[PDB]
Amino acid sequence: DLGTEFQSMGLELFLDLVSQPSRAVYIFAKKNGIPLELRTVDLVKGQHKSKEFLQINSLGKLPTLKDGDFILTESSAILIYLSCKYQTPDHWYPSDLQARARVHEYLGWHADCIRGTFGIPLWVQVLGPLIGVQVPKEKVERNRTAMDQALQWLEDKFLGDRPFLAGQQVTLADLMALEELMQPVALGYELFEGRPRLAAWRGRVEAFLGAELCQEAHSIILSILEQAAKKTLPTPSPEAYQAMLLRIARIP
Amino acid sequence: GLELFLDLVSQPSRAVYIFAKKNGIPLELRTVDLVKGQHKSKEFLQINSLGKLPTLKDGDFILTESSAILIYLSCKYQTPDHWYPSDLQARARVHEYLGWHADCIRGTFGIPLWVQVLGPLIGVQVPKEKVERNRTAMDQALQWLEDKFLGDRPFLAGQQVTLADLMALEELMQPVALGYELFEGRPRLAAWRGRVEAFLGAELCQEAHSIILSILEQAAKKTLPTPSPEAYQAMLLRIARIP
Ligand SMILES: N[C@@H](CCC(=O)N[C@@H](CS)C(=O)NCC(=O)O)C(=O)O
Numbered sequence: 001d002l003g004t005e006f007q008s009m010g011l012e013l014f015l016d017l018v019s020q021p022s023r024a025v026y027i028f029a030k031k032n033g034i035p036l037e038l039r040t041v042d043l044v045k046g047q048h049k050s051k052e053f054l055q056i057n058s059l060g061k062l063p064t065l066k067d068g069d070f071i072l073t074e075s076s077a078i079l080i081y082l083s084c085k086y087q088t089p090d091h092w093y094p095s096d097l098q099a100r101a102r103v104h105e106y107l108g109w110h111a112d113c114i115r116g117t118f119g120i121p122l123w124v125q126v127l128g129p130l131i132g133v134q135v136p137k138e139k140v141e142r143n144r145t146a147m148d149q150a151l152q153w154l155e156d157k158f159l160g161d162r163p164f165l166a167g168q169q170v171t172l173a174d175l176m177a178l179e180e181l182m183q184p185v186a187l188g189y190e191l192f193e194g195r196p197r198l199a200a201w202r203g204r205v206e207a208f209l210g211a212e213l214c215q216e217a218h219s220i221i222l223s224i225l226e227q228a229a230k231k232t233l234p235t236p237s238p239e240a241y242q243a244m245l246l247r248i249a250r251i252p
Numbered sequence: 253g254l255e256l257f258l259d260l261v262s263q264p265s266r267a268v269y270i271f272a273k274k275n276g277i278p279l280e281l282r283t284v285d286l287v288k289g290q291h292k293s294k295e296f297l298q299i300n301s302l303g304k305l306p307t308l309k310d311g312d313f314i315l316t317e318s319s320a321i322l323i324y325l326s327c328k329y330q331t332p333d334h335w336y337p338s339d340l341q342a343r344a345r346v347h348e349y350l351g352w353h354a355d356c357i358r359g360t361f362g363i364p365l366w367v368q369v370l371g372p373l374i375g376v377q378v379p380k381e382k383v384e385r386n387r388t389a390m391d392q393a394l395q396w397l398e399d400k401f402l403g404d405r406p407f408l409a410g411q412q413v414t415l416a417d418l419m420a421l422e423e424l425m426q427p428v429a430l431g432y433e434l435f436e437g438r439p440r441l442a443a444w445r446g447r448v449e450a451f452l453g454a455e456l457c458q459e460a461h462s463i464i465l466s467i468l469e470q471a472a473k474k475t476l477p478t479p480s481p482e483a484y485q486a487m488l489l490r491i492a493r494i495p
């Protein structure tokens with residue numbers, strides 16, 4: 001038992017930029033100059049279900065942080081953990097009791113109404129057809145309606161007449177939300193059209209993060225539909241296939 | 253004074269109720285009857301536009317989400333550190349559980365109430381295929397609870413009871429109350445429940461679980477309220493997101 005499933009010199013982030021929470025953690029680290037050894041784990045190929053990866057995260061999900069012997073999953077937990085270990089600027093995760101509660105409030109609602117809803121178009125347009133499975137139209141339509149309702153709440157409850165989702169500055173909440181919303185955008189769902197306040201929010205977040213950073217975070221997802229069309233994606237392993245079938249059958 | 257809007261039929265409502273009672277945080281409890289539809293009434297929507305429970309009102313500061321409310325209260329009233337430890341890694345274990353919980357527990361464990369009580373109340377059956385898929389999903393999630401989170405440790409995020417255990421126990425009680433004996437065959441999980449329940453106290457557990465433990469019989473006796481049209485609408489949407 002040599003622990004050769006090989007460490008980098010420092011902090012390791014196991015990720016795939018096709019994944020929304022992977023992109024959120026990637027961006028946070030890059031923007032703050034947190035030195036991470038990025039380890040690519042190819043979801044479509046099934047490397048997350050490889051013997052090697054399951055030794056690191058038994059759940060076989062991305063992203064995963066490895067800080068020495070300390071292995072941490074869940075983007076929200078990773079983002080917060082990095083923020084306090086690397087003492088990032090307060091605005092991301094405010095200390096103030098109430099401003100922090102607003103971030104935790106968004107992250108909780110996000111997990112219910114954004115996560116698991118906005119990623120469905122990749123399954124419909126790319127990943128299902130990749131393994132010969134079509135998502136029924138009734139479900140696609142239901143998903144479109146749910147996305148619309150969630151965006152409406154995003155504007156009305158969280159953003160309102162304010163600049164960011166949880167107050168006056170960019171927080172972990174804005175990062176999490178943007179990267180989920182990018183998944184359908186990259187597949188040609190024009191989510192920001194007809195929604196000016198959300199559109200301006202997007203520009204505000206991207207302006208803050210920086211074009212070059214956004215560009216390289218989103219590169220892979222912005223190209224995936226065209227790659228699928230030209231049949232250049234990996235063939236899923238049997239383990240990825242199993243997981244894919246389960247995810248597709250979780251679509252309501 | 254603090255106000256907590258809740259219904260003890262609701263899992264996250266129960267989690268917050270328990271935390272506050274156990275720590276003696278003085279709350280004005282404000283019952284909002286979910287089955288009736290009071291959560292979609294105009295007066296409650298003036299409090300939480302999302303129309304969901306639980307909701308906390310601290311002066312003119314209105315906060316939703318049980319996880320966020322639990323953390324807020326923990327800091328506000330400076331409760332024993334173990335619930336929400338300050339230590340960087342012990343804290344992350346709590347947040348890690350809460351994130352996974354929101355994916356794999358919340359939305360899966362509540363389904364049997366919809367299958368057995370709430371759907372039938374408004375004339376809608378959940379298809380057998382979905383009930384079986386749900387049973388399989390609960391069993392996979394329980395397995396992860398035991399293998400990844402508990403392991404051979406006493407609680408879900410370490411050596412002491414945290415917010416994670418409270419959230420987990422109250423979701424797991426929903427099917428238990430409806431006759432799913434999900435602790436059968438799972439010694440680590442059964443032991444964990446014993447530990448948590450011993451810490452909270454028998455009386456507090458009984459108060460928190462009384463309503464959900466009597467709901468099946470209320471459905472059988474036909475004594476549940478008639479949902480408002482707004483509640484009916486929300487019910488139909490919830491039922492249709494069952495996969
Ligand atoms: N709530 C988790 C979600 C993690 C997650 O489900 N990640 C996906 C990629 S976006 C994954 O690894 N899926 C592979 C699988 O479930 O087999 C987080 O934000 O970290």
Ligand SMILES: N[C@@H](CCC(=O)N[C@@H](CS)C(=O)NCC(=O)O)C(=O)O
Pocket residue numbers: 108109112261262263264265286291303304305306316317318319358486
């Ligand atoms: N993630 C939220 C979930 C809140 C929630 O969905 N509560 C349910 C009752 S358990 C509710 O109010 N449902 C009514 C509806 O959605 O119309 C939390 O833990 O507070």
